[PDB]
Swiss-Prot record, chain A:
Gene this protein is translated from: atpB
The protein's role, per its UniProt record: Produces ATP from ADP in the presence of a proton gradient across the membrane. The V-type beta chain is a regulatory subunit.
UniProt name for this protein: V-type ATP synthase beta chain
Top-rank taxon: Bacteria
Similarity-based family: Belongs to the ATPase alpha/beta chains family.
Swiss-Prot record, chain B:
Keywords recorded for this protein, A-Z: ATP synthesis, Hydrogen ion transport, Ion transport, Transport
Gene Ontology molecular function: any one: proton-transporting ATP synthase activity, rotational mechanism
One term under GO cellular component: proton-transporting two-sector ATPase complex, catalytic domain
Family: Belongs to the V-ATPase E subunit family.
Phylogenetic lineage: Bacteria, Thermotogati, Deinococcota, Deinococci, Thermales
Protein's name in the database: V-type ATP synthase subunit E
GO biological process, one term: proton motive force-driven plasma membrane ATP synthesis
Source domain of life: Bacteria
Species of origin: Thermus thermophilus (strain ATCC 27634 / DSM 579 / HB8)
The protein's role, per its UniProt record: Produces ATP from ADP in the presence of a proton gradient across the membrane.
Length: 119, 62
């Protein structure tokens, strides 16, 4: 625990309240206890592609954060898969990235292991 | 009469005041336009350039 650098900065994203009013800090266990009668995906991946960390304001160079997009949902509707393919195919986070995404098919076994993986 | 002399000069000063008033209202009109036109042009140039920089991004990304 000792080895671990202390937080000191935010990370930008161009998404407003959710950096501004309350602010995503580095390392942070950013937890979207949601309104779950409303689904994630959009507000998720919206703020995915839109998100990008940049320490302009710090006056430290920006060409030093290989911007590595790691994506995990699970039990996923194919519907949502197509929303994926929709968002993604725009963004280069089509492709600087992994998806990992346990289809609603995807047997319950792999389901389990799912999290550990890209982590 | 001296009586009508005062009526003359009085009315006449109102004539002078109307024109003068009008000029100031014309300037006020004038000044709206200048700012407005300028204010329209910048923001829409602005926007297009951003839509440009972002457009190429997606291209490059391909």
């Amino acid at each position: 625990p000792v080895a671990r650098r202390k937080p000191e900065q935010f990370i930008q994203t161009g998404i407003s309240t959710i950096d501004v009013m309350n602010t995503l800090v580095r390392g942070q266990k950013l937890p979207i206890f949601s309104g779950s009668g409303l689904p994630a995906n959009e507000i998720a991946a919206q703020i995915a592609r839109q998100a990008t960390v940049r320490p302009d304001l710090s006056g430290e160079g920006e060409k030093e954060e290989p911007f590595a997009v790691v994506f995990a949902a699970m039990g996923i509707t194919q519907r949502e898969l197509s929303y994926f393919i929709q968002e993604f195919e725009r963004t280069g986070a089509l492709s600087r990235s992994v998806l990992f995404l346990n289809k609603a098919d995807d047997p319950t076994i792999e389901r389990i292991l799912t999290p550990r993986m890209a982590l | 009469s001296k009586l009508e002399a005062i009526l003359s000069q009085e009315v006449e000063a109102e004539i002078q005041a109307l024109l003068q008033e009008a000029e100031a209202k014309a300037e006020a009109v004038k000044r709206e336009a200048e700012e407005k036109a300028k204010a329209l042009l910048q923001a829409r140039e602005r926007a297009l350039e951003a839509q440009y920089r972002a457009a190429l991004r997606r291209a490059e990304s391909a």
